[PDB]
Symmetry: C3
């Protein structure tokens, strides 16, 4: 299948996992600013647009860490071999959003192809889920406003291990262009170290060649 | 009455409403900084004080968007024709706060009259609710400290649709005076677009003549 | 014993306490930046390290306010005469953390002695709680990344009154070195005033001689 069962008994975090999954169930969010000064430059020298590029880079970073691709399947802890991004699309006409997903691909060009293709087919579709699989990552965008913090207050997040990432409008801060990015995870599968690792990797990706 | 029943069946967000009200119940908070450089100037040229003015302007912006004045009445979705601000009052003597409300009025002078009047009558009243109706907005102030984020962790927010707004101590950031403002809403009636719209409108109001 | 039963009937906040403990159960978090420009200087002129010093100063500030040392014992409201810090320790080897506590002491040198001693004995211990009493404060550190906000989403926090403090990586902001610090408390025992008071006291402590 496209997932492997995780060896929970020999895992270094097995105590932590039981602890934060059942003893003291919790998750946390954190908002940090990513420096997109370099990325903006690379975007400027290309035909790629900002949203699709950030989706790609967030999916890329996620795809690099097992702890960000865990799930409960058949009451067992698994790791997805790979996850596809699920992202929000605003409909200016109805002022409502939809959620769409498209297959992740390590080739940025093939990813762009997938993205346009999905966007092509459902741009007009106002259902909440126009498409109607489980190895996903959630990405949302609030481009109309800058924020220093964002937190989702969910009534029930039992065994909800997929990361939720929210980005705000970027802004010029001195000489840098900063993007606020909120990350919300479940404490059973992710510690603060794990989140900081993801953010630092994303920052390095933004600071690198697209191709 | 002072409210209208909302047409949920022909609403563009009907799916979203059921989704975030019962399928996946949730709300979110966001903190953004409002630029009060201009407002400070207008305040300086007037006899109005800061708190009462912000309450007025927050109530004014709210009063402009239906999605911020929704409620459940008799198991039905309604919109208040208008909401009155409910705001916190600190008692230096007991170091405790109270919550008071006063009628909103589009005339800033008449609003000030209402405010002083309520403050006059209960300044000495240490009960939590000295006054003892439901079309409200909640406004709170933390003037003693600056914050970049604020979030309320509520054990049960079922059908709780009124916005909660928290403001921190403002501060000088370069050439601007910024005020941190947290907004917490229920995802059944408000999307990120809706919150960004409110904040942008508030910013425009701060940047405009008081009268 | 090391705690006193609190006089809830003659307390100015008795209504607030019942209100936020049972009527509308809630807590809140807030992230603010502390200016550690001065502290860094004092650290530079000493042999003390950053983490142990912040733990000491956070415990010191806490130890100064009753509202931050409340608990439910035998279904009664009590105040701890003093609380000891419980702080996280990262294991680079396993990339996992542990929680340790050590006795608080108003003498910074004796505190350092306690700290080293605990760290000495369990540096190698990967259990979640290597040590296996209740008058504590929770301190956590995310030194690998800067954040503007941090919030813990806990499924059940009934009667959980001990403060939770999270610090991020500090950073240079103009001429100042700022440290992001998140504070999460229960609204039954703490108001926004109470949190601002703690943060302002901490800022003053950072800005003062160590000894
Ligand atoms: C795990 C879970 O409960 O996910 C639910 C919950 C879900 C993750 C949803 C997709 C999407 O709305 C998510 C966003 C980011 C949508 C936009 C914002 O409003 C966020 C506040 C929001 C939080 C969670 C939410 C609402 C879900 C799905 C979608 C499945 C896959 C596809 C392509 C539709 C799900 O059930 O699988
Ligand atoms: C909807 C609901 O549950 O509101 C409850 C909950 C309520 C909104 C309350 C008014 C006021 O404390 C609110 C503030 C901002 C008070 C100050 C802070 O501590 C906030 C953390 C807090 C959150 C919600 C709270 C505590 C309520 C009222 C008040 C009704 C109207 C008037 C004039 C008193 C209510 O029940 O109607
Ligand atoms: C009150 C309560 O429920 O505390 C539980 C919950 C607890 C406070 C825990 C100690 C420590 O993990 C705490 C940290 C900061 C640990 C690191 C992060 O992951 C935080 C997200 C986390 C939140 C709460 C938590 C997980 C507890 C203890 C510890 C008791 C004392 C000692 C020396 C071990 C407890 O039960 O007493
Ligand atoms: Co279990
Ligand atoms: Co791989
Ligand atoms: Co329903
Ligand atoms: Co109107
Ligand atoms: Co009770
Ligand atoms: Co003492």
């Amino acid at each position: 299948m496209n997932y492997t069962k995780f060896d929970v008994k020999n895992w270094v975090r097995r105590e932590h996992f039981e602890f934060y999954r059942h003893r003291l169930p919790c998750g946390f969010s954190l908002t940090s600013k990513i420096d997109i000064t370099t990325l903006k430059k690379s975007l400027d020298d290309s035909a790629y647009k900002f949203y699709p590029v950030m989706i790609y880079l967030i999916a890329q970073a996620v795809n690099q860490f097992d702890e960000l691709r865990m799930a409960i399947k058949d009451d067992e802890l698994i790791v997805w071999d790979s996850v596809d991004p699920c992202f929000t699309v605003f409909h200016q006409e109805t002022e409502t959003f939809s959620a769409l997903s498209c297959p992740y691909s390590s080739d940025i060009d093939q990813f762009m192809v997938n993205y346009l293709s999905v966007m092509e087919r459902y741009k007009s579709d106002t259902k909440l889920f126009p498409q109607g699989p489980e190895n996903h990552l959630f990405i949302s965008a609030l481009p109309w406003v800058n924020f220093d913090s964002f937190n989702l207050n969910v009534a029930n997040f039992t065994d909800f291990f997929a990361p939720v990432i929210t980005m705000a409008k970027y802004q010029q801060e001195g000489d840098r262009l900063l993007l606020p990015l909120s990350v919300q995870v479940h404490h059973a599968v992710c510690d603060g170290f794990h989140v900081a690792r993801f953010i630092n990797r994303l920052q390095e990706l933004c600071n690198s060649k697209l191709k």
